[PDB]
Amino acid sequence: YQRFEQAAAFGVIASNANCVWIPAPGQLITSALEDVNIWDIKTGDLVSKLSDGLPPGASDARGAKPAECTYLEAHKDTDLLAVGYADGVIKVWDLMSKTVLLNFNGHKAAITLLQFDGTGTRLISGSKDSNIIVWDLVGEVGLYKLRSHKDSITGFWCQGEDWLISTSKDGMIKLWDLKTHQCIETHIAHTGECWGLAVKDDLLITTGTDSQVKIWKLDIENDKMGGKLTEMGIFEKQSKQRGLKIEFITNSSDKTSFFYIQNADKTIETFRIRKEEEIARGLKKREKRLLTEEEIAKSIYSSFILHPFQTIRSLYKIKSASWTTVSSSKLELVLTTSSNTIEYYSIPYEKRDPTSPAPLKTHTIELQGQRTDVRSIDISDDNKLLATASNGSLKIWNIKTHKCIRTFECGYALTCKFLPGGLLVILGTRNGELQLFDLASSSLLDTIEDAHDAAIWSLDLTSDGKRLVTGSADKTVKFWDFKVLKLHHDTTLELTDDILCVRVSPDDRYLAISLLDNTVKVFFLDSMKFYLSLYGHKLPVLSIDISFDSKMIITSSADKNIKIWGLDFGDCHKSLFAHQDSIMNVKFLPQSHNFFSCSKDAVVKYWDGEKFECIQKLYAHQSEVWALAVATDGGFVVSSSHDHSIRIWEETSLKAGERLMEALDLGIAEIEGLEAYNRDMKLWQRKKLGEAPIKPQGNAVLIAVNKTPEQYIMDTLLRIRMSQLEDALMVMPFSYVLKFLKFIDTVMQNKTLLHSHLPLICKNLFFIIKFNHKELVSQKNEELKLQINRVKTELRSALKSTEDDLGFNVQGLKFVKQQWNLRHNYEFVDEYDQQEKESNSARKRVFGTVI
Amino acid sequence: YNVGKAEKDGEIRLKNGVAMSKEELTREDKNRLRRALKRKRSK
Amino acid sequence: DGLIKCLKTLDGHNNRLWALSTMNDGDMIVSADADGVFQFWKDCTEQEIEEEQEKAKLQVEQEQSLQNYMSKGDWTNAFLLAMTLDHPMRLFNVLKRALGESRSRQEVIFNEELDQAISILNDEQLILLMKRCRDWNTNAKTHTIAQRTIRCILMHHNIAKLSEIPGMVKIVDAIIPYTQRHFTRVDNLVEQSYILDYALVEMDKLF
Amino acid sequence: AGSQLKNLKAALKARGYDREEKKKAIAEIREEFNPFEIKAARNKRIAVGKPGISKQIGEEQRKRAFEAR
């Protein structure tokens, strides 16, 4: 088969991520969906779209959504870009050659921050699962995983090798000793979430849910447990929403610091922090009226040391920001907003006055976007493309360059079409208005106010183009002719129900209209004849398509399935269930019975109309695919979605016993090696110090598991099971029994792991010598005789030491119970009433017996 | 006397004897103890 | 009764009720009357969640303190924080670690600072400590830690106090027979520990 | 060696809203894991017949011959 693929994607400038700024104002790296694009603020031309080397839609593209980019981060000097995606992976690229250097999957959910540290070679990454991982770049390895937060890492701040400090989407800020990787000090920052973190070395600043911004003093050289990071006071903002990024600078040329808190909505609150001279010369002024009350006033600091500044607003909702500074009169701040647009503002400040009632944007890159989701896409014969938006941004892109060359202002526009000669656009809006535009001249040929009483929903030209059909939610369809280049309403068909799709056949034959009442009706255009009524879809029914032979129609709806109908008798053929949310649009190919359907769950799907298979399952969008349009000839198809994207699609095993034996042999070899080393040390310290042994290096596996040999043998002796322990001890020969006795003799000098394994040592040792008693008492060596005596003394001392406190506790606890009894048990002198009282007050337990 | 279940609700008391507190268990042992309780319910 | 919107029913009175006067400052003191008996309901949600969030703040500080003590060593203040937070597995770990290092180094069975810290805890703390010792004593493994803790309680507290604490007989009657079971088992271990002595007398008869 | 059930579960994990792939896979595993409708001899130096299919064509042939007579 001649399958499909993706040629190019565009329409996005700023997506659901952050932005990094690079100096030459300068350029900007930001996110498109799953690929990063670089822009020069000066002009705004797309100078780079760094993308994955595999086209989404190819043979090896995997069966899921692609990983949306979610955090840009840049190493300036050594020229790297660490970008991180929504599945958790981190790709590190060199910006010179634009290839992938490092892949750093690691995480389990989407990631929220990156940071290079010690400028090169180290990258720390925080994610929507609460881990935060340190990575080395010279080893390609996750070094450390700091794991104690609970919800989602909202920010952190590190210095090199000793201290990190993170704050997460619970209420908690944490300080991490990066030598031990244990959390040192934990506070509750804000009572809900904690969304911000910034610090200029003395003061730390955090923000939470609503306007309460908290100043902290971190004293890194502190020694107390609670008090490495203390809280110094709160203050307020003007926004009652989530401040979610704070960032600082030190402008030179005096020395000064500025920080911003961007908000959820539309607003960045900028702040100047002042200097120690005006701290000292402002302290007395609030210390006026002359001291317990004045000390309470001086303690209740934030408004003192912090100074608000020019509160920069924007038109849309703010997603990310970053700035640069010179002279303290060029706080030059780039800002990517949600409705895709970047904006380069710059506030001046004459070091006392900010010299403006409201700041000024110096650049704005917004030409290659829409600011809303494209509710309708269209195409020329083959050359141009039509994108229809809610703000009014009709845009005429071109296929061969992916640049909008022509754009207008219409309104809440949901459907549009071209006109068959090209260079002319019809469009209908969500109120009762229709509009006409062109390509060479300006916007409005004419608008028709009161084109319909209510929301228009779908229009269609005839194949010659002179006559178009508009169906609207005022329960009417209308017909319009082109009189000479103006619209002529002549007839109108009022239905009982809100018509929401129209279509004609591609040979002027049928008019199929989709009603809100779960059905479609097929009419004859030449008679308004009411040929057919196709029924049985069971929810209101979206896009129709008529085939090129005018024999076969498709019918999409919100029932998550498309139905194929034969138009000769109105008989159904398939009812194939696609698309688990809602099929928004469905379109045939030009010459074939193959078709495409794009749906509300971020997927387009390629089907055939003969076997009714799914030919292909294309997976490049991220959100609700609102429209798609096929070429008139040739058959390449464009699809446009809710993530502001427009994309083209073209054609192409030991056991117990022997484990204990090998553990015993290496353990006792290490043990008597160290004992020979100690005898060598005593002889070369008691004799002429001219020589000694060189070095016994400790065993590989013993230093690899970090265990003394007694502990190594002790845990493998633990790890054999009780059912095969009497076999594990019976398999081993008498030489291993003798070195087992050496092992027990050494282990009851370390009285820590003697007392934690007393019954195990007793059981194993007594079975060993009880089984090997005949040979043991025939061995003739005073070393083993002294060994047995030493083991006997230390073992029996440990056992009598534990049963001493056992017997003590028995007699003490029964004394306690008995003195409680003789204090207040009861008063019976008569033995029969006494025994009946004790029988009524006894402990009962009921048992299931068999008779 | 035999070690039943805990008389609190932030506590987990196995019949071994080892009482664990839910505020002191990490999330790995929380998932592991939940699956183990699911096994002992399912039998 | 009076009910609020739906959640948070109020205790009300015994019988019928034609009364609601809630209209002080924002919605300040509410008054509600039965046949005769009045009720004066207090305030807005402004401090009963503040004391809850500040005890959450205190608890998350002392939990981190307990983690730092358990890491760096320091078993006495770790013990009293585990007893204050009631973290029983951590309490078993601090007692087991301190007991093992007590066997290592060298009247006193833990270190002196920790068994003084056991000597100065009050009634409900030692009743939860002895409940922990009760259900550790049911093992034959974790029973030595329970016996050392029972022993230091017995030799550092007053026996009349320990008897007259309400609840200290349903615990000590639970753990007398388990200590007797362990006494029988360890005594039989000492009994069968004399095969070493028999093997030594054979090894000396060997010449 | 290993069970026909274990090999059948392995074949289902091997083969894994298309229809004809499932028609092909189901027919393939049916005519593979049905060994009693072929006949196999032993090569003294192997599917040598299809008994049920030969039987049904030999009896349908004489069935239509009998109805014709």
Residue A471 amino acid letter: G
Cα distances (angstroms) measured from residue A434 to each of A114, A452, C77: 49, 8, 79
Listing DSSP states for A186-249 in one string gives: EEE-SSS-----EEETTEEEEE-SSS-EEEEEE-TT--SSTTSEEEEEEE--S--S---EEEEE
Chain A residues touching residue C104 (CB < 8 angstroms)? 750-752
Q: Which residues of C touch B18 (CB under 8 A)?
A: 89, 92, 142
**Token pair listed for C54:** 């500040």
**Cβ count near C51 (within 10 Å):** 9
What's the CA gap between A787 and A770, in Å, rounded? 16
Rounded distance between C-alpha atoms, residue C171 and residue C183, angstroms: 18
How far is Cα A71 from Cα A261, in angstroms, rounded to an integer?
Answer: 19
**What is the rounded distance in angstroms from the CA atom of residue C38 to the CA atom of residue C47?**
24
C-alpha span between A250 and A258 (Å, rounded)? 7
Q: SS3 of D15, please?
A: helix
Is A734 in the C-facing interface, judged by CB distances under 8 Å? no
- What are the phi and psi torsion angles at A616 (to 5°)? -155, 155
Q: Containing H/E element for A702?
A: helix A700-705
A361 with A344: CB under 8 angstroms? yes
C-alpha to C-alpha distance for A635 and A643, rounded to whole angstroms = 24
Reference A378, options A591, A124, A180, A638; nearest CA is A638
Residues whose CB is less than 8 angstroms from the CB of residue D62 and which lie 6 or more positions away in sequence, other chains included: none
String of b and e for A785-813 (b: at least 16 CB within 10 Å)? bebbeebbebbbebbeebbebbebbbebb
Alpha-carbon distance C95 to C153, whole Å? Answer: 13
Asked if the Cβ–Cβ distance from A577 to D20 is below 8 Å, we say no
For residue C174, list chain A residues with Cβ-Cβ distance below 8 A: none
Tokens at A9, concatenated: 């994607």
DSSP string, A10-52: ES-SS-SS-EEEEE--EEEEEE-SSSEEEEETTT--EEEEE--
Phi, psi for residue C3 in degrees, rounded to 5: -125, 155
Cβ atoms of residues A650 and A5 within 8 Å: yes
Q: Residue A144, class by beta-carbon neighbours within 10 Å (0-12 exposed, 13-18 middle, 19+ buried)?
A: middle
> How far is residue A479's CA from residue A452's CA, in Å, rounded to a whole number?
11
Here the tokens at position A720 are 């054999």
Encoded tokens for A287? 């210390």
Please give the Cα distance from A567 to A193 (Å, whole number). Answer: 58
- SS3 call for C99: helix
Residue C73, classed as helix, strand or coil, is coil
- C-alpha dihedral, C100 to C104 to C107 to C108, nearest 10°: -50
Q: What whole-number distance in Å separates Cα of residue A640 and Cα of residue A629?
A: 9
- Chain A neighbours (≥3 Cβ pairs under 8 A) are C, D
* Cβ partners under 8 Å of residue A162, min gap 6: A177, A178, A179
* Burial class of residue A827, CB neighbours in 10 A (0-12, 13-18, 19+): exposed
Contacts of A260 by beta carbon, 8 Å cutoff, 6+ apart: A245, A246, A247, A268, A269, A270, A271, A321, A323, A333
Give the three-state DSSP class for D29: helix
Helix pair angle (A658-686, A709-719), 10° resolution: 170
List all chains that touch chain D, counting a touch as 3 or more CB pairs closer than 8 Å.
A
Judged by CB atoms closer than 8 Å, whether chains meet at A802 and C175 is answered as: no
Q: Among positive and negative, which fits the CA dihedral A272, A275, A277, A281? A: positive
From residue A756, how far is each of A76, A721, A768, C118, C182 by CA, in Å? 57, 18, 20, 22, 15
> Distance between alpha carbon A840 and the CA centroid of its chain, in Å?
66
* b (16+ CB within 10 A) / e for A732-751: beeebbbbbbbbbbbbbeeb
Closest listed residue to residue A784, CA positions, set A767, A799, A796, A772:
A772
Nearest-by-CA chain B residue for C67: B24
Please report the residues numbered 1 through 43 in chain B whose beta carbons come closer than 8 angstroms to any beta carbon of chain C: 1-3, 11, 13, 16-21, 23-24
Q: How far is B6 from chain C (nearest CA, A)?
A: 11
Q: Are A506 and A466 in contact (CB under 8 A)?
A: no
Q: Where is chain A broken, named by the residue before each break, C–N > 2.5 Å?
A: 24, 290, 300, 484, 652
End-to-end Cα, chain C, rounded Å = 98
Long-range contacts of A493-498 (CB under 8 A, 24+ apart): A493/A528, A498/A457, A498/A473, A498/A474
Token pair recorded at residue A599: 């749906």
| Cα A681 to Cα A5: distance, rounded to the nearest angstrom | 77
Contact C176 A813 (CB under 8 A): yes
A103 φ, ψ (degrees, to nearest 5): -115, 125
CA distance linking residue A175 with residue A220, whole number of Å: 10
Please, which residues have CB within 8 angstroms of residue A714's CB and are 6 or more apart in sequence?
A747, A753, A757
Tell which of A775, A810, A813 to mutate to test the C interface (max C CBs under 10 Å).
A813
Selection from A477, A637, A609 nearest residue A553 by Cα: A609
CA–CA gap between residue A152 and residue A127 (Å, rounded): 6
The answer to whether A443 and A408 have CB atoms below 8 angstroms apart is: yes
Surface-to-core class of residue C99, CB atoms within 10 Å of its CB (0-12 exposed, 13-18 middle, 19+ buried): buried
Residues facing A146 on adjacent strands: A132
Q: Where are the beta strands (DSSP E) in A369-495?
A: 376-379, 384-388, 395-398, 404-407, 413-418, 424-429, 433-438, 446-449, 456-461, 467-472, 476-483, 486-494
B17 contacts C89 by C-beta, under 8 angstroms: no
At residue B27, the 3 state secondary structure works out as helix
Residues 6+ apart with CB under 8 A from A586: A543, A544, A545, A554, A555, A556, A562, A595, A596, A597, A598
200-259 of A, contacting C, C-beta below 8 A? 225-226
CB-CB neighbours of C55 under 10 Å? 10
Sheet with A467-472, strands from edge to edge, namely: A456-461, A467-472, A476-483, A486-494
Classify burial at A1, counting beta carbons within 10 Å of its beta carbon; exposed 0-12, middle 13-18, buried 19 or more: exposed
Are A38 and A50 contacting, i.e. CB atoms less than 8 angstroms apart?
yes
Neighbouring-strand partners of residue A572: A565
> Would you say how long chain B is, in residues?
43
Sheet holding A360-365, edge to edge: A318-324, A331-337, A341-347, A360-365
Distance CA A488, CA A826 (A): 110
Instruction: Using CB atoms, pick whichever of C86, C90, C135 lies closest to residue B3.
Output: C135
Q: Looking at beta carbons, which residues of chain C come within 8 Å of A788?
A: 196, 199-200, 203
Q: Which DSSP category does A79 fall into?
A: T
SS3 for A728-792 is HHHHCCHHHHHHHHHHHHHHCCCHHHHHCCHHHHHHHHHHHHHHCHHHHCCCCCHHHHHHHHHHH
Tell me the residue type at A766: F
Contact A437, A408 (CB under 8 A): yes
Listed in sequence order, the residues at least 6 apart from B43 whose beta carbon sits closer than 8 Å to its beta carbon are none
Q: In Å, what is the CA distance from A283 to each residue of A277, A290, A292, A582, C104? A: 10, 13, 16, 64, 58
Torsion sign (Cα): A196, A197, A200, A202: positive
Contact assignment for B17 to C174 by CB distance below 8 Å:
no
DSSP string for A612-664:
--EEEEE---SS-EEEEEE-SSS--EEEEETTS-EEEEEE----TTHHHHHHH
D59 touches chain A (CB under 8 A): no
Question: Residue A652: CB partners within 8 Å, gap ≥ 6?
Answer: A2, A3, A4, A5
At residue A560, what are phi and psi to the nearest 5 degrees? Answer: 60, 20
Collect all residues with Cβ–Cβ distance below 8 Å to A717 and sequence separation of at least 6: A660, A663, A760, A764
* Nearest CA distance, C145 vs chain B (angstrom): 12
Are the CB atoms for A236 and A213 separated by under 8 Å? yes
Give A577 to chain D, closest Cα distance, Å.
8
The number of CA neighbours under 13 Å toward the Cβ of A210 is: 3
User: Minimal Cα–Cα distance from B30 to chain C, Å?
Assistant: 14
Chain C residue with Cα closest to B18: C89
* Residues in Cβ contact with A305 at an 8 Å cutoff, skipping those fewer than 6 apart: A203, A215, A273, A274, A279
Q: Are strands A267-273 and A571-574 parallel, antiparallel or unpaired?
A: unpaired
Q: Which chain A residues are closer than 8 Å to D19 by Cβ? A: 611-613
Q: How far apart are CA B15 and CA A216, in angstroms?
A: 47
CA–CA–CA angle A670, A675, A676 (5° rounding): 100
What φ, ψ does residue D24 adopt, rounded to 5°? -65, -45
With tokens 């009632």, the residue in question is A357
SS3 string of A400-413? CCCCEEEECCCCCE
CA distance A365 to A32: 14
Coil, helix or strand at residue A166: strand
- Give the C-alpha separation, C101 to C73, whole Å: 11
Q: What 3-state DSSP class applies to C115?
A: helix
Chains C and B touch (3+ CB pairs under 8 A): yes
Quote the CA–CA distance of A86 and A17 in Å, as a whole number: 10
Residue A353 carries which side chain, given as an amino acid letter?
Answer: D
Round to whole Å and give the CA distance between A63 and A68. Answer: 15
Question: Tokens at residue A312, please?
Answer: 């920069």
Q: How far is CA A836 from CA A124, A833, A842, A846, C88, in A?
A: 75, 5, 10, 19, 41
Contact check, Cβ <8 Å, A819/C163: yes
Give the mutation candidate from C133, C189, C202, C204 for the A interface (greatest A CB count, under 10 A).
Answer: C189
Burial class (CB in 10 A: 0-12, 13-18, 19+), A600: buried
Three-state secondary-structure class, residue D21: helix
Q: Which residues of B touch C90 (CB under 8 A)?
A: 21, 24
User: Cβ neighbours of residue A504 under 8 Å, at least 6 residues apart?
Assistant: A460, A461, A462, A463, A469, A510, A511, A512, A525, A546
Contact A770 C180 (CB under 8 A): no
Cβ–Cβ under 8 Å, residues A597 and A562: yes
If DSSP codes are grouped into helix, strand and coil, which group holds residue A502?
A: strand
CB contact under 8 A, C150 and A777: no
- What backbone phi and psi angles, to 5 degrees, belong to A502? -125, 160
Burial of residue C146 (CB within 10 Å: 0-12, 13-18, 19+) is buried
CA distances from A230 to A166, A208, A224, C57 (A): 15, 17, 11, 13
Solved using: cryo-EM
Q: In whole angstroms, give the CA distance from residue A779 to residue A772.
A: 11
Interface contact C88-B16, CB threshold 8 A? no
- Read off the tokens for C64: 């981190």
Q: By the 8 A CB rule, do A368 and A360 touch?
A: no
Nearest of A642, A590, A634, A589 to residue A616 by alpha carbon: A589
Chain mean position to CA C45: 33
Residue C21 DSSP code: B
A267 phi and psi angles, rounded to 5 deg: -145, 130
The answer to whether the CB atoms of D18 and A613 lie below 8 A apart is yes
In terms of CA atoms, which chain D residue is nearest residue A561?
D17
CA–CA separation, A611 and A331 (whole Å): 64
| Residues shown for chain D | 69
- The Cα–Cα gap between C74 and D30 comes to 70
Could you tell me which residues are beta bridge partners of residue A91?
A: A83, A103
**C-alpha span between A333 and D58 (Å, rounded):** 89
Buried-state track B15-40, b at ≥16 Cβ within 10 A, e below 16: eebbbbbeebbeeeeeeeeeeeeeee
Q: Nearest CA to A754 among C105, C193, C149, C100? A: C100
Phi, psi (deg, nearest 5) at residue C137: -70, -5
Number of cross-chain residue pairs from B and C with Cβ atoms under 8 Å apart: 39
The partner residue sitting opposite A577, judged by closest CB among D17, D19, D20, is D17
